[PDB]
């Protein structure tokens, strides 16, 4: 997520036509950065309310929802909007596939740990495998 403070220098070197606003007071740079921040927050959040989504995007409460709904209906991001609760949902994990992924990660961790042990003390690993097989 790109805060505006690190973009003041970037806005200075932009060519003038790239610095034009969009008839609402916000230029091109701090609309592309808004969309980028919202897309990147879609990856860090399972869901987020409108007030909180606008808190970290500096867009007060409503244009946050407008931009979030605009990034959808175009395929640019996944998720739906419950306007009654004022919540944008990005991605839901269906428990069992998450269980599969976590089991696979655990097995990969086991394999990596065994590889590290073998590469650290190869003689001990060989003698331990020999003792285990018996």
């Amino acid at each position: 997520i790109i805060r505006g403070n690190q973009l003041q220098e970037f806005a200075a070197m932009l060519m003038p036509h790239q610095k034009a606003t969009t008839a609402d007071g916000s230029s091109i740079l701090d609309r592309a950065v808004i969309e980028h921040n919202l897309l990147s927050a879609s990856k860090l959040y399972n869901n987020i309310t409108f007030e909180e989504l606008g808190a970290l995007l500096e867009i007060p409460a409503a244009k946050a929802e407008k931009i979030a709904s605009q990034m959808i209906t175009e395929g640019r991001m996944n998720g739906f909007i419950d306007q009654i609760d004022g919540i944008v949902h990005f991605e839901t994990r269906e428990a069992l596939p998450t269980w599969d992924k976590q089991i696979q990660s655990l097995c990969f961790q086991v394999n990596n740990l065994l590889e590290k042990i073998s590469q650290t003390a190869p003689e001990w690993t060989a003698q331990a495998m020999e003792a285990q097989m018996a």
Partner: protein
């Protein structure tokens, strides 16, 4: 107002328009929502609540 919708061929068929385009705008607007306020749709579509409900 006095240029296109004066002959009985466009003036008669304009009522079908402003309804197909409204329908398309409504379809695009409610695509990312799972629950949406009817007054919100009325504000977006510029028509009142009763017309939004009928549409």
């Amino acid at each position: 107002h006095s240029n296109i919708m004066d002959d009985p061929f466009i003036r008669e068929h304009i009522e079908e328009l402003l309804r197909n385009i409204r329908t398309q705008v409504l379809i695009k607007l409610i695509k990312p929502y799972t629950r949406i306020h009817i007054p919100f749709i009325s504000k977006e579509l510029n028509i009142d609540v009763a017309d939004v409900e009928s549409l």
